[PDB]
Structure 1
Amino acid sequence: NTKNVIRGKYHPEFLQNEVLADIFAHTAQTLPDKTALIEADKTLSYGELYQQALIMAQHLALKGVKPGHIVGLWLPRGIELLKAQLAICLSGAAWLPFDMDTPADRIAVCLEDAEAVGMITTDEWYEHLAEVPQTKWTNTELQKPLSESVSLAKTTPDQPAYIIYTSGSTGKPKGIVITQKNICHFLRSENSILGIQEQDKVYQGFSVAFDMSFEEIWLSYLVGATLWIAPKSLVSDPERLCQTLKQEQITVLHAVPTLLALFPEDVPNLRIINLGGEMCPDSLVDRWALPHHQMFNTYGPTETTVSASLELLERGKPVTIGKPLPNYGMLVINSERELLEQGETGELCIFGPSVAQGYLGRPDLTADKFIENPWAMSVEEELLYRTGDLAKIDEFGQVHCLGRAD
């Protein structure tokens, strides 16, 4: 028995023999006529989005894209960006998302490092990529009519689903490889607690280069909710966003605390508020943890798929990172990879089926940061990711972070 290893709830049913394409295809075939995406006054249904992304995927297959390949993604916020992401997904390949403000040289170095077979962009933005050697396709040319149907090879759970390169890093590139298994499990695990529903209308304001975009997009895809895609102009105007959320009857908001703290008024019809990025300050909890709001705080590194722990915020309750997500787990070690007794301070480590494959093409660093778990109780717990954060375990079984080890 041990009180120095904290586990999320035990839900083995969240580990299915599935890939992202299966989740989306299920939703699209089950709710073909429900609105999936909204961009300004433009709407697209799940069935329409599915068929268009399928045509794009068949075009990708004709150009040589196959399961396991990596395809870049660089488009403006809107419907075409999400459709291109889905097109890459349905072809069986993994996508490399680039923020809208990524410089071309950074795109080049990231595509080279990932050995990407190509990337998708727009006709307008195509001109800005003279220095990129890799093949570049436009969303327009991938949407032309096909003369005959192309069969798409299926990807498998062990294959990559996407690779995250830290947007805004000028240092040597470090690609984090997330597998289909990682992300499918994460989606089911976190939604078992958040509870995004088909009736929800979800704000989509994060760039696809950031983890929380998944919580906006794919959680929605999981249950068939509708996405309202914010334009670039809106993302920098908190008052205007606060009003837009009311006018459009948005019910789910994923955001970071600093953005929420800049809202002048309450947005009463927000069912769910998921705050990632940083721990929520007490004043903001007192301001927004109202009876008609379910206010959450998610913590977790990119290397363990989007999020690793989740806390329900409530007025008067001190803020913590909460407990691990279902089937996730956390423990604490010292400088020499030894399990610490409850109460002692050390490096926080995370395990579970959502621990990433590692860093792309950097096996030394991967082996230094992804280590064997001598205390695993199942095959899904055999890999610890070392967060680099100091932490200790409360006398109440709660993890408390204490800054960085450096």
Structure 2
Amino acid sequence: TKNVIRGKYHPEFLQNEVLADIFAHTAQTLPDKTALIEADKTLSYGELYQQALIMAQHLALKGVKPGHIVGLWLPRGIELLKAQLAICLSGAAWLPFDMDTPADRIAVCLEDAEAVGMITTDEWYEHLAEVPQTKWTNTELQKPLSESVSLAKTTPDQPAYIIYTSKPKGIVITQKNICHFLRSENSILGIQEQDKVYQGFSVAFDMSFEEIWLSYLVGATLWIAPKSLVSDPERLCQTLKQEQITVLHAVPTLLALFPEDVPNLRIINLGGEMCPDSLVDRWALPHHQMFNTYGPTETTVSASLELLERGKPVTIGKPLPNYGMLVINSERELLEQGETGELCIFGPSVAQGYLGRPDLTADKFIENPWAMSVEEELLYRTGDLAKIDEFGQVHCLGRA
């Protein structure tokens, strides 16, 4: 009633599926298309699938089953994504670690998650003497097999990945959460099979999912950035032109540091900070579709998306399809439109909660007295203060 704002109604984005289903569909439908480009090395979707499958079978032999958590720590490049996909194909969920993660934090996170192990490279294996958990190398997980190993299937209720944010706090995202997010957001972004997608985010960040898994969803080609390029905005601008990139997921401060426009960019998805007006004016051109995505990690990558246009005020926009937002008071009561309260998010992509933290989970994932379907019974309290304006639009106002 103007005080509960919903994204478009799209029940077809909820399927009886897991991430392995989405990727396998793409690889079997487009075997010979290039999936991954690292420098001058390229891997096809079919190649990627068979290699990741061999790795997943090795994980199975070593005891990885659906519902397990496997840590991921490798340098940016093909092997890193390959290993992510191998964990996924084994039916386990992955716990991603940035290149710059200290070994002690790795140990704290693997312990907190009760992970059965982690994947890393021969080189980095020695940095992990402090890690008591099992460490596998991608290399050993890539050796030939004598007889095939049958992979147990995971289910939508099972975790797809665990994101840590610091006492470390692990956020459990389910297969259902992430598969729905991918379909819901791509229905608006519309990444296409012909697209060439820059892959610059560390796997430890939400926007890596928009770079990688949206592409996997439609069979786009990923160009994987080296560590040295990620901190060189002018060189990156020239790289994006020379590599004929069409899709940039990035943060506003990075876009602002580009000297020239990059004409070949179909889609520009800015997340993290609300895009400033000067940047919109500089970039919200006709040959660019410039977007602003907002959302906590606790509701799978993004919860709202906004089309940016020169001269139009910037807001977080409307919820994604099947997402919903409302505002509540200090005692969890729905507020009339226009008042200021805590922004709450609901829908099929609300995370399962905080790993091993029933306390904080119950504090922040509460029952929704106002759910109009079984996919709306869980409200996540963002902690942000917000108001719903006279146009059904949510306005952020800072923390509570």
Q: Alpha-carbon deviation of 1:218?
A: 0.1
What TM-score, normalized by structure 1, do the two folds share? 0.98
Q: Deviations over 1:122-169 (max 9, x none)?
A: 00000000000000000000000000000000000000000001xxxx
Q: Deviations over 1:341-374 (max 9, x none)?
A: 0000000000000000000000010000000000
SS at match of 2:55: helix
SS at match of 2:127: coil
Mapped to 2, the partners of 1:171 and 1:9 lie a distance apart of 34
* Aligned counterpart, 2:350: 355
1:203-242 equivalences under 5 Å are: 203-242=198-237
Q: Deviations over 1:145-198 (max 9, x none)?
A: 000000000000000000001xxxx95110000000000000000000000000
Mapped to 1, the partners of 2:260 and 2:11 lie a distance apart of 42
Mapped to 1, the partners of 2:343 and 2:178 lie a distance apart of 22
What percentage of residue pairs aligned between the two structures are identical?
Answer: 100
Mapped to 2, the partners of 1:231 and 1:364 lie a distance apart of 40
SS at match of 1:183: helix
Q: Deviations over 1:269-297 (max 9, x none)?
A: 00000000110000000000000000000
Mapped to 2, the partners of 1:179 and 1:333 lie a distance apart of 26
SS at match of 2:229: helix
SS at match of 1:228: strand
CA pair 293-157 structure 1, distance change in 2 beyond 3 A: same
Q: Alpha-carbon deviation of 1:334?
A: 0.5
Mapped to 2, the partners of 1:157 and 1:222 lie a distance apart of 17
Mapped to 2, the partners of 1:325 and 1:375 lie a distance apart of 18
RMSD over equivalenced CA pairs, Å: 0.6
Mapped to 1, the partners of 2:135 and 2:341 lie a distance apart of 46
Does residue 255 of the first structure (1) align with residue 254 of the second (2)?
Answer: no
Mapped to 2, the partners of 1:293 and 1:63 lie a distance apart of 47
Q: Deviations over 1:79-128 (max 9, x none)?
A: 00000000000000000000000000000000000000000000000000
SS at match of 1:127: helix
Mapped to 2, the partners of 1:41 and 1:144 lie a distance apart of 24
Mapped to 2, the partners of 1:21 and 1:55 lie a distance apart of 14
Q: Deviations over 1:230-282 (max 9, x none)?
A: 00000000000000000000000000000000000000000000000110000
* Aligned counterpart, 2:116: 117
Q: Which runs of 4+ in 1 moved over 6 A?
A: none
Mapped to 2, the partners of 1:193 and 1:171 lie a distance apart of 32
Mapped to 2, the partners of 1:268 and 1:132 lie a distance apart of 47
Mapped to 1, the partners of 2:360 and 2:282 lie a distance apart of 42
1:214-363 equivalences under 5 Å are: 214-363=209-358
Q: Which runs of 5+ in 2 are unaligned?
A: none
Mapped to 2, the partners of 1:173 and 1:236 lie a distance apart of 27
Mapped to 1, the partners of 2:309 and 2:33 lie a distance apart of 34
SS at match of 1:72: strand
Mapped to 2, the partners of 1:64 and 1:379 lie a distance apart of 34
Mapped to 2, the partners of 1:296 and 1:3 lie a distance apart of 24
Mapped to 2, the partners of 1:358 and 1:65 lie a distance apart of 23
SS at match of 1:235: coil
Mapped to 1, the partners of 2:330 and 2:323 lie a distance apart of 23
SS at match of 1:83: helix
Q: Which runs of 5+ in 1 are unaligned?
A: none
Q: Alpha-carbon deviation of 1:395?
A: 0.5
Q: Alpha-carbon deviation of 1:213?
A: 0.0
CA pair 160-171 structure 1, distance change in 2 beyond 3 A: closer
Q: Alpha-carbon deviation of 1:378?
A: 0.4
Mapped to 1, the partners of 2:205 and 2:28 lie a distance apart of 28
Mapped to 1, the partners of 2:390 and 2:28 lie a distance apart of 49
SS at match of 1:396: coil
1:400 is aligned, of 370, 395, 398, to 395
SS at match of 2:123: helix
Mapped to 2, the partners of 1:317 and 1:217 lie a distance apart of 30
* Aligned counterpart, 2:180: 185
SS at match of 1:250: coil
1:355-394 equivalences under 5 Å are: 355-394=350-389
Mapped to 2, the partners of 1:337 and 1:3 lie a distance apart of 18
Mapped to 2, the partners of 1:250 and 1:54 lie a distance apart of 29
What TM-score, normalized by structure 2, do the two folds share? 1.00
SS at match of 2:311: coil
Mapped to 2, the partners of 1:94 and 1:383 lie a distance apart of 22
